[PDB]
TrEMBL record, chains A, B:
This is N-acetylglucosamine-1-phosphodiester alpha-N-acetylglucosaminidase. Glycans are attached at N194, N276. The keyword Transmembrane applies. N-acetyl-alpha-D-glucosamine binds at F121, D266, G267, S270, R296. Keywords: Disulfide bond, EGF-like domain, Membrane, Repeat, Signal, Transmembrane, Transmembrane helix. The keyword Signal applies. The chain holds residues 49 to 355 of 605 of the full protein.
Length: 307, 307
């Protein structure tokens, strides 16, 4: 069991901004009009593998000129409507019980080919956070908390960005999967982090810690899509302020991989990549009894499985 | 398929020294008398798990004062006689056909809980190298080539060091597993690398490349045992002259983990750690078609399985 000692928290108080979807609409740049999310038809390649999972080891140079090697995975999903599931921790109903569980354990319940940790959660109580829809079922309605969202609609539409409560409750072309992160990294192929800071953080003293959350290097995970509508999962190992990538670096890395929209999921010691049910990354938390590293018990999971 | 582009080769000519076991005996330090290998009764904990597999991420400082993070795995095996197998590539008979195969593919044929790449092989032809005994069966008799050896005898004796041909053909308490590496890292708890250079390399121009093989940082793997007779498997990710550890650093790392005898197995792009049949490390070779990394098709495999 992990010690939970690499905590990378975007908020010091309540999770998410306090302002409404309408506030987000009214503050976004004029280029985006009145619509606060993007849509893309998912790819639907029946004559292709379910996914391709690739390992990268790359040299990143930060602003100060310092070089660092980072390691991680990029996963490309060819038929997201059929193969992608947002899973509650442990099993259906896990969120109602404030249950936390390793990615690998949750992943095995659905024989996920690739699984990563998913959304944010209360690291003291285990409470789930954000909006959650799992295989067509509404698991958690945040009441319109304005954090970055990723969803899939019944007709295969991929959705990225900010959603109202009315949006997620829509019964026309309803969401079949939905999860929330913190920070919209890329919008229409451009870095959207400064816009995210304004949308997803209260304009208070909170912004200092939130900008640190953005600027510090750590382990990170993200989900996005490319121009063909393939879903892209991203993971990079790290440790807060010691190894890994900050969100500017993640967004640039994904942009160069031709990702068009992408959101940041949970990171730090939460970041986990699981291949066919086996841990296949280097987590940053220490195990309770040693100098060894241990995967963290987390909340929702993003699972890629056979159609 | 991997491009085989991180090659870490100890020899520029034929594999191994040209001199006999008697030569090795006659040149070793007086402290070791006339016996050129060590023995340890294997642990036999029936009331324990098969293995414990631990992840490390550690800061290494080299001679020049330069700091680097390295990542890898330490696996502890509680009943080695029952749980450890040396596997030919692909399946029994693979060496006879100069067959190469991914660790993960070979590992799945025996449902290995943990598997690593094993011995050296000819990177042009695929020919197996060293001595090989797999589950009691003599696969390859090198004819007494004096490289570092790891074996398990029928009565559970762990054997590390230099062996004659007569030693490996012994029908009293015969070897049930046997594999060869290059360099005996630790002997009786002390670093034995300089002694290994003398034993395992011809005293010719070859020593320059061999000392580079020892001194350069790269991905590395090793096998050893602790004072209780538990088998210890070691893996560290890396890339020759860019990331990872040199053999001095590996020996010191293992010595601090209370490893008493240990040999160096194949490294560079060969180094692979596989958990329950899934790749669970970051290989250094590039894939044939990309900037992505790919596991290498290698030769023998060290497999830990259920008794
Ligand atoms: C992403 O956004 C950050 C934050 O922007 C800042 O906060 C927002 C909440 C909002 O209020 C913005 O209006 C505001 O800029 C950007 O980081 C900021 O970048 C600006 C511009 O580079 C910096 O402004 C400078 O602040 C100095 C005091 O700390 C001040 O002395 C500077 O003025 C002097 O020097 C400059 C030349 O360097 C010159 O232009 C002036 O005329 C004067 O000589 C200047 O005002 C902020 O300090 C930065 N704030 C933080 C917290 O870093 C960031 O650049 C942006 N990134 C991208 C990629 O868009
Ligand atoms: C592991 O082994 C290496 C190799 O040892 C060398 O090669 C072997 C095959 C064998 O022949 C040995 O006899 C031989 O030493 C060790 O690395 C060597 O270390 C020695 C001693 O430190 C070095 O000797 C020095 O060589 C210089 C020329 O390059 C020479 O100028 C030096 O003499 C001057 O300076 C020293 C003080 O630094 C002083 O003692 C002298 O009196 C004189 O002022 C000195 O002779 C070798 O160059 C090293 N060789 C290589 C290839 O690095 C290594 O130390 C050892 N490691 C461990 C942990 O045991």
């Amino acid at each position: 069991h992990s010690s939970d000692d690499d905590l990378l928290l975007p908020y010091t108080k309540s999770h998410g901004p306090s302002h409404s979807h309408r506030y987000v609409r009214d503050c976004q740049p004029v280029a985006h009009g009145t619509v606060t999310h993007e849509t893309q038809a998912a790819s639907k390649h029946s004559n292709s593998p379910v996914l391709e999972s690739n390992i990268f080891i790359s040299d990143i140079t930060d602003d100060s000129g310092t070089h660092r090697w980072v390691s991680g995975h990029i996963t490309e999903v060819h038929d997201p409507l059929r193969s992608v599931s947002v899973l509650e921790p442990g099993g259906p109903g896990g969120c109602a019980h404030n249950h936390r569980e390793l990615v690998e354990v949750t992943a095995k319940t659905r024989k996920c080919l690739v699984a990563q940790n998913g959304g944010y959660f209360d690291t003291h109580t285990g409470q789930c956070l954000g909006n959650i829809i799992s295989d067509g079922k509404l698991v958690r309605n945040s009441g319109g908390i304005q954090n970055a969202q990723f969803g899939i609609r019944k007709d295969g539409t991929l959705v990225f960005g900010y959603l109202s409560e009315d949006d997620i409750l829509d019964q026309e072309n309803p969401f079949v999967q939905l999860i929330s992160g913190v920070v919209w990294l890329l919008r229409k192929g451009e870095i959207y982090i400064n816009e995210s800071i304004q949308a997803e953080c209260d304009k208070t003293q909170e912004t200092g810690n939130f900008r640190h959350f953005v600027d510090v290097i750590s382990a990170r995970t993200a989900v996005g899509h490319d121009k063909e509508g393939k879903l892209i999962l991203f993971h990079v190992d790290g440790q807060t302020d010691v190894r890994g990538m900050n969100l500017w670096q993640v967004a640039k890395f994904l942009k160069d991989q031709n990702v068009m929209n992408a959101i940041n999921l949970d990171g730090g010691g939460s970041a986990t990549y699981v291949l066919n049910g086996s841990l296949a990354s280097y987590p940053s938390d220490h195990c309770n009894p040693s100098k060894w590293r241990c995967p963290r018990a987390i909340s929702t999971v993003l699972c890629i499985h056979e159609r």
